[PDB]
């Protein structure tokens, strides 16, 4: 299979190895106590948290003594979120550890070197947001995804655009083993003796462009959310095809081994980001 | 503090060639996207040209498209914009500009639009015989 | 290819007073405009990016607000120092596309 290496990154599976809507793979105990917490190897491009029945960003910090805040670190002397990301190198500018590190594996980083309610015996670190607009890292204090039984749901929206969600675990060559970019003219399919085949069960939904059809494919992406249970490892309907002279998402939950060169089609995982094309 | 130090401008004959500098300090030079921004004096800003931080892409004006080639080193903290054939209606004050904020997507480009943060001095290019 | 058209081109005002600047597009630039002040003869410093979000070490005098085609860059209490030029910047496409500028002036 010529297409073993290339197509390693789109495993998501082993390249992410957590859910994607909601990322609780992993658990920490803080002073007794255990919690779930975020743990995916890989960013998520574009997801943010929406505060349904609330004008409130979920970026901004939570109350300070719930509905009036968000979900984001609160302030703090000194002031460690929001942190440009030259404040950011600057502060561990003596740290060796962060000069060949990249704007968003810092921004992990540097949320995971916070303590969790004076626990310093605790391996729970926070997941934190990384904003675009001006080049700045969020620490998140509430590190939950879903709650629609405050009621908020994860989402990719053309506000959250910008946003990177990013756990503890992000790897600092996500450059290269992470997907980000969508595939102009490539359709994923499975390699089936010595030719590239289409999927044979996928699900095709309406989309009138490509950001529709990455938002279907993360709302139906692996999902840690409760119904070490309750956790995908990434296995979850991660992918699509979109059709764009047709307009149609094909999502699927099987990993692609190859790519087909169709001029109308551009591939799309819950990972990528719901508009960039190489 | 963050300093965007400019060179090279002066006076060049229609039809000839100068190349701009751009020096950044105080930050890391690859992170950040970069534009060279022009100022006809007296009159508004005309944005000229847009390079990402790898350098791969370039995006270029329209009235420039051709002539002029943005580049960076940025192993040496520095950018750069070749203007060839130049013409008298080129004679403008050249800024370069860091990019921290990204705003909206060009496709099938692959490359953002930025607004700087810092500006550059300013460097005078007069093309006139 | 957008055009902004910022008025009015020179705003004379006194020291304490409130002062908006307009400046608006021939098409949606969604969110993405940013204000910034030029004084004579010096480079240009950054004021407002996402047309609502203030730079840090901006005065909290400055504000602005806006998105699709309608933008204002606002300044509630004058000082000496704000008296300068304004221009805003669309950054939502290529081609980038500035305002000519607002020449703000100190009337005595």
């Known amino acids: 299979n010529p297409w073993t290496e290339y197509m390693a990154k789109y495993d998501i599976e082993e390249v992410h190895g957590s859910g994607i809507r909601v990322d609780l793979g992993e658990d920490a105990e803080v002073a007794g106590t255990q919690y779930r917490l975020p743990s995916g190897k890989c960013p998520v491009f574009g997801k943010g948290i929406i505060i349904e029945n609330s004008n409130t960003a979920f970026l901004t910090p939570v109350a300070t003594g719930l509905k009036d805040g968000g979900f984001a670190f609160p302030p703090t002397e000194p002031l460690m979120s929001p942190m440009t990301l030259d404040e950011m190198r600057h502060f561990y500018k003596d740290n060796k550890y962060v000069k060949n590190l990249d704007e968003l594996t810092l921004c992990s980083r540097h949320a995971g070197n916070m303590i969790p309610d004076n626990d310093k015996n605790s391996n729970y670190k926070y997941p934190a947001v990384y904003d675009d607009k001006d080049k700045k890292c969020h620490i998140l204090y509430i590190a939950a995804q879903e709650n629609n039984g405050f009621c908020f749901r994860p989402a990719k929206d053309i506000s959250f655009q910008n946003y990177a969600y990013l756990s503890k675990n992000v790897v600092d060559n996500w450059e290269k083993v992470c997907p980000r970019k969508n595939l102009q003219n490539a359709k994923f399919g499975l390699w089936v003796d010595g030719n590239c085949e289409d999927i044979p069960h996928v699900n095709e939904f309406p989309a009138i462009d490509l950001f529709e059809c990455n938002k279907l494919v993360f709302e139906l992406s692996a999902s840690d959310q409760p119904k070490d249970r309750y956790k995908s490892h990434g296995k979850g309907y991660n992918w699509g095809n979109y059709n764009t002279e047709t307009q149609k998402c094909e999502i699927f939950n099987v990993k692609p081994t190859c790519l087909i060169n169709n001029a109308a089609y551009i591939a799309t995982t819950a990972l990528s980001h719901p508009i960039e094309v190489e | 503090q963050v300093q965007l130090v400019q060179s090279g401008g002066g006076l060049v004959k229609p039809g000839g060639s100068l190349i701009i500098s751009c020096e950044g300090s105080?930050?890391?030079?690859?992170?950040?996207?970069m534009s060279w921004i022009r100022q006809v004096p007296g009159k508004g800003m005309e944005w000229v040209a847009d390079i990402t931080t790898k350098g791969d892409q370039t995006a270029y004006a329209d009235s420039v498209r051709g002539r002029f080639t943005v580049s960076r080193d940025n192993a040496k903290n520095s950018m750069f914009l070749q203007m060839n054939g130049l013409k008298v209606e080129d004679t403008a004050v050249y800024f370069c500009?860091?990019?921290?904020?990204?705003?909206?997507?060009?496709?099938?480009?692959?490359?953002?639009?930025?607004?700087?943060?810092?500006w550059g001095q300013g460097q005078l290019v007069t093309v006139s015989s | 290819d957008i055009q902004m058209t910022q008025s009015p081109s020179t705003l004379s005002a006194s020291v304490g007073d409130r002062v908006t600047i307009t400046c608006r597009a021939s098409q949606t630039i969604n969110n993405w405009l940013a204000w910034y002040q030029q004084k004579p003869g010096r480079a240009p410093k950054v004021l407002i990016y996402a047309a609502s979000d203030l730079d840090s070490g901006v005065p909290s005098r400055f504000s602005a607000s806006g998105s699709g085609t309608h933008f204002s860059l606002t300044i509630s209490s004058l000082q000496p120092d704000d008296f300068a030029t304004y221009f805003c910047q669309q950054y939502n496409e290529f081609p980038v596309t500035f305002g000519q500028g607002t020449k703000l002036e100190l009337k005595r």
């Open positions: 500009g860091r990019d921290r904020f990204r705003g909206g997507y060009n496709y099938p480009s692959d490359i953002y639009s930025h607004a700087p943060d810092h």
């Open positions: 105080g930050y890391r030079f690859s992170d950040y996207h």
